[PDB]
Amino acid sequence: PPISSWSVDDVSNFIRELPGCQDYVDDFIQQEIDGQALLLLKEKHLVNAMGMKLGPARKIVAKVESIK
Amino acid sequence: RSQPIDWTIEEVIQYIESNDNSLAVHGDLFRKHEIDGKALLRLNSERMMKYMGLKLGPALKICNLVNKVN
């Protein structure tokens, strides 16, 4: 299914399962990030609003764009 | 037929809800904050999160809709 159809739960699974040394699922659940929101989520938001480091933020944004 | 800047609170809510049904749960918040046309165009994510208590997801979706009519 298109990311635009993803629920908050689909996004949570996507994030928690993203291979890496940390887990950002709680961060996403707290912000009610569904598929539509995930498509709109950019580095500036992850970093300046959610307090994520730029490296991880860029990689998430990049993964989303690759999937789409 | 009336355009954005002259929208009433209900017209703003109808715009948001008719374009993104997942945001309808926040309708009463828009009523509470008296978000009419002029107020809608004046919104931003920081104000929505800090003053309306909206989470980032909903705020970003609303900003996306605001941008279309601004």
UniProtKB/Swiss-Prot annotation, chain A:
Annotated compartments: Nucleus
Record-annotated SAM domain positions: 6-68
Tissue expression as described in the entry: Salivary glands.
Effect of L46A: Little effect on Scm-binding activity
Subunit and interaction comment: Component of PRC1 complex, which contains many PcG proteins like Pc, ph, Scm, Psc, Sce and also chromatin-remodeling proteins such as histone deacetylases. This complex is distinct from the Esc/E(z) complex, at least composed of esc, E(z), Su(z)12, HDAC1/Rpd3 and Caf1-55. The 2 complexes however cooperate and interact together during the first 3 hours of development to establish PcG silencing. Interacts with the SAM domain of Scm via its SAM domain in vitro. Interacts with Trl in vivo and with corto in vitro.
Function (record text): Polycomb group (PcG) protein. PcG proteins act by forming multiprotein complexes, which are required to maintain the transcriptionally repressive state of homeotic genes throughout development. PcG proteins are not required to initiate repression, but to maintain it during later stages of development. Component of the PcG multiprotein PRC1 complex, a complex that acts via chromatin remodeling and modification of histones; it mediates monoubiquitination of histone H2A 'Lys-118', rendering chromatin heritably changed in its expressibility.
Record-given protein name: Polyhomeotic-proximal chromatin protein
Lineage: Eukaryota, Metazoa, Ecdysozoa, Arthropoda, Hexapoda
From-to range in the entire protein, with total length: 1508 to 1575 of 1589
Swiss-Prot record, chain B:
UniProt-annotated location(s): Nucleus
Impact reported for K61E: Complete loss of function. Partial loss of self-binding activity. Complete loss of ph-p binding activity
SAM domain location: 7-70
Top-level taxonomic group: Eukaryota
Annotated effect of mutating E17G: No effect on function. Shows self- and ph-p binding activity comparable to wild-type
Comment, domains: The SAM domain is essential for function.
Family label: Belongs to the SCM family.
Subunit structure: Scm associates with the PRC1 core complex containing PSC, PC, PH and Sce/RING1. Forms homotypic and heterotypic interactions. Interacts with the SAM domain of ph-p via its SAM domain in vitro. Interacts with corto in vitro.
Free-text function comment from the UniProt entry: Polycomb group (PcG) protein. PcG proteins act by forming multiprotein complexes, which are required to maintain the transcriptionally repressive state of homeotic genes throughout development. PcG proteins are not required to initiate repression, but to maintain it during later stages of development. They probably act via the methylation of histones, rendering chromatin heritably changed in its expressibility.
The protein's name: Polycomb protein Scm
Organism listed in the record: Drosophila melanogaster (Fruit fly)
Lineage: Eukaryota, Metazoa, Ecdysozoa, Arthropoda, Hexapoda
Record gene name: Scm
Residue span relative to the full protein: 800 to 869 of 877
